[PDB]
Each structure stands twice: as structure tokens, then as C-alpha cells.
Design an enzyme around this catalytic site. Structure first.
Site, short mmCIF file in Angstrom:
data_model
loop_
_atom_site.label_atom_id
_atom_site.label_comp_id
_atom_site.label_asym_id
_atom_site.label_seq_id
_atom_site.Cartn_x
_atom_site.Cartn_y
_atom_site.Cartn_z
N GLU A 1 0.86 -1.23 0.00
CA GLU A 1 0.00 0.00 0.00
C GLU A 1 0.88 1.25 0.00
O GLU A 1 0.65 2.13 -0.83
CB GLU A 1 -0.92 0.11 1.21
CG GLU A 1 -2.39 -0.01 0.87
CD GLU A 1 -2.86 0.88 -0.27
OE1 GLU A 1 -2.72 2.15 -0.19
OE2 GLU A 1 -3.36 0.29 -1.25
N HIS B 1 -7.53 -3.70 -2.79
CA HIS B 1 -6.38 -3.03 -3.46
C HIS B 1 -6.70 -1.54 -3.56
O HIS B 1 -7.91 -1.22 -3.58
CB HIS B 1 -6.11 -3.69 -4.82
CG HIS B 1 -4.96 -3.14 -5.59
ND1 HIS B 1 -3.70 -3.70 -5.55
CD2 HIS B 1 -4.88 -2.09 -6.46
CE1 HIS B 1 -2.88 -3.02 -6.34
NE2 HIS B 1 -3.58 -2.03 -6.90
N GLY C 1 -5.79 3.02 0.28
CA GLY C 1 -5.35 4.30 0.88
C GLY C 1 -4.42 4.06 2.07
O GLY C 1 -4.62 3.06 2.75
#
Ligand SMILES: CNc1cc(F)cc2cc(C(=O)Nc3ccc(C(=O)O)cc3)c(=O)[nH]c12
Length: 198
Positions: free
Chosen positions: A36, A96, A99
Site C-alpha cells: 500500500e 487493493h 489508501g
């Protein structure tokens, strides 16, 4: 309204982390925390401002991601009266593109360092909550964003130690999908490193 809404979001991710980061026992959610953050560094490279991304595995089983992009804007939002960086680090938005607030939420600790417009800016978070507003700690000629996170052992069990090979596979994959972007992976635990460029 924003402070209340941000804390609802952190609480939401805390209670139902499977909806945001994935499985919290088998290591797939723990490694996704890295990916991420790295994905955010890849957006800045794809905007044409970042050339090198450095992913480090530290000895204390935290991971930092460093970019040489232009740095997250630090200007206090006239709207919600805190740094644009803090908005980005705390506001929510499948499993996915979730943030960076999700990683923040599920991190015991998270360190933000921004180099931009001649100054270094630093901020600490605990479980997604800023210890203090973003603050100038010194001056610099450099630009970029550094995020280091210590995963919450409240959230993550069983597989709690980052595996070099799992980060290595995905980072090599990301450099293949984004030609131009250069990625360094370094393990402070044993000195291992790699460089992924396509
Ligand atoms: C390790 N790097 C990294 C980790 C992370 F969790 C978030 C980010 C977010 C940005 C960003 O919003 N960059 C950005 C946004 C707006 C401007 C502008 O308007 O000038 C510039 C950079 C970034 O550049 N790097 C990040």
C-alpha cells in the site's frame, strides 16, 4: 466534523481489518501494508517527480518507504485546518488501492518525514492518530517522502516478521509494470539488497 469522521474511519478499519488489508494471521495482510505504502510512492514516480524508491526492512521489524518525489504538500488546508499531509495520512479513500490511512490505522507507530520547499517536516502517529501537527525540524536542499511503520501486534498475529522474498517478488513485479521506476530493497537484519529496474 472531520476529526469525528477520521476517528470513525480508524475505528472502522481497526474492528474489521479483513475488509481493508486482508488476512491478519497468514502474513498476506502484513506484507500488503508495505505494498500500500510503496503504491503511493509509485503514483509520485508515474507523475514524473520520483526516480528512486527505497524500501528498507529494519531490525525492529518496521518497514520504511523513501521516495525522491516533491514531498506531500504541508500547507494547512484552509478547509479542515490541518496539514494536507495529515489529511492524506488519516482520511479513508476493494482490497487493493485501499489508501495509506489503513496502514496508519493498523500501525502501532508511523513516522512521516517530508523534505519540501527548503525544509524537513516530521510527524508521529500511534494507531493512526497524530501525536502532534506536522512540524518543521530543520532545513534541506532535497525533496521526497519517507514513511516508516511498526505494524500493530494487536492486529497482526502468527506471521509478524516481514519476509525479504515476499517483498522482493512484488517489488520486482511493480518495477516490471512501471518501466522507468527504480526500486531498492534492503534488509538491515542481514545486509541483503536488490535493485529492480525495467
Ligand atoms: C513513501 N512515499 C509516500 C508514502 C505515502 F504513504 C504517501 C505518499 C503520498 C505522496 C503524495 O501525495 N505526493 C504528492 C501529492 C501532491 C503534490 C503537489 O500538489 O505538489 C505533490 C506530491 C507521495 O508523494 N509519496 C508518498
Amino acid at each position: 466534523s472531520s476529526s469525528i469522521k477520521v476517528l470513525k474511519g480508524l475505528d472502522a478499519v481497526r474492528k474489521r481489518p479483513g475488509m481493508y488489508i486482508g488476512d491478519t494471521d497468514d502474513g498476506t495482510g502484513l506484507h500488503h501494508m508495505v505494498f500500500e505504502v510503496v503504491d503511493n510512492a509509485i503514483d509520485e514516480a508515474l507523475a514524473g517527480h520520483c526516480k528512486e524508491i527505497i524500501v528498507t526492512i529494519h531490525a525492529d521489524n518496521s518497514v520504511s518507504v523513501q521516495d525522491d518525489g516533491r514531498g506531500i504538500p504541508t500547507g494547512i488546508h484552509p478547509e479542515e485546518g490541518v496539514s494536507a499531509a495529515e489529511v492524506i495520512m488519516t482520511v479513508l479513500h476493494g482490497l487493493h488501492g485501499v489508501g495509506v490511512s489503513v496502514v496508519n490505522a493498523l500501525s502501532q507507530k508511523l513516522e512521516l518525514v517530508i523534505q519540501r520547499e527548503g525544509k524537513i517536516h516530521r510527524q508521529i502517529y500511534e494507531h493512526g492518530v497524530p501525536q502532534a501537527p506536522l512540524a518543521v525540524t530543520g532545513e534541506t536542499e532535497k525533496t521526497g517522502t519517507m514513511v516508516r511503520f511498526w505494524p500493530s501486534l494487536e492486529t497482526f498475529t502468527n506471521v509478524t516478521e516481514f519476509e525479504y522474498e515476499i517483498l522482493a517478488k512484488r517489488l520486482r513485479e511493480l518495477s516490471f509494470l512501471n518501466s522507468g521506476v527504480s526500486i531498492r530493497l534492503r534488509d538491515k537484519r542481514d545486509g541483503k539488497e536488490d535493485h529492480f529496474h525495467y
